[PDB]
Amino acid sequence: MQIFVKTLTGRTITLEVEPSDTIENVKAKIQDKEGIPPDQQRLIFAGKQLEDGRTLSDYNIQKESTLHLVLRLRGG
Amino acid sequence: MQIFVKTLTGRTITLEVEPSDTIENVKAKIQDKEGIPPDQQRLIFAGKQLEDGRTLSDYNIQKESTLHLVLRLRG
């Protein structure tokens, strides 16, 4: 299914995902598509930060839902 | 000299730079430190989108000043 991933300035991309995909999985897909390392990514749905080990369906993320992506700048 | 690079969540890092560094050079340093491809980096100082061919002193970016890093999400 298709979901949207959005930045705080409104920039948007689309991802192909499965309901059982983990957030870890989703970050790997963003890396594949955009070249952003998974440990630089923080994903947000319904104003809450998503945990790597949980699935899309765990968070009731559905087709055409929108997630927000922000940078961790984890390299410091 | 050091400058700050800040995101729209407030996440802020410090970068060691020179006035003569080009914006391209700075994005390379960000790629070096954070693993973010330069093509994903939009840098903004005093309301302006920074262009790769110009230098920090070119934009009057001085010691201890802050610029913003925002994602492009192109590729």
Author numbering:
A (entry chain A): 1 to 76
B (entry chain B): 1 to 75
Article passage:
During ubiquitination, the 76-amino acid protein ubiquitin (Ub) is attached via its C terminus to, most commonly, Lys residues on substrate proteins. Ub has seven internal Lys residues and an N-terminal amino group, all of which can be ubiquitinated, leading to the formation of polyUb chains. For the remaining four chain types, linked via K6, K27, K29, and K33, very little is known, and proteins generating and recognizing these chains in eukaryotic cells are still elusive. We found that the human HECT E3 ligases UBE3C and AREL1 assemble K48/K29- and K11/K33-linked Ub chains, respectively, and can be used in combination with DUBs to generate K29- and K33-linked chains for biochemical and structural analyses.
We crystallized K33-linked di- and triUbs. The K33-linked diUb crystallized in space group I4, not observed previously for Ub, and a structure to 1.85 Å resolution revealed eight molecules forming four identical Ub dimers with clear electron density for the K33 linkages. The symmetric interface did not provide a model for the conformation of a longer K33 chain.
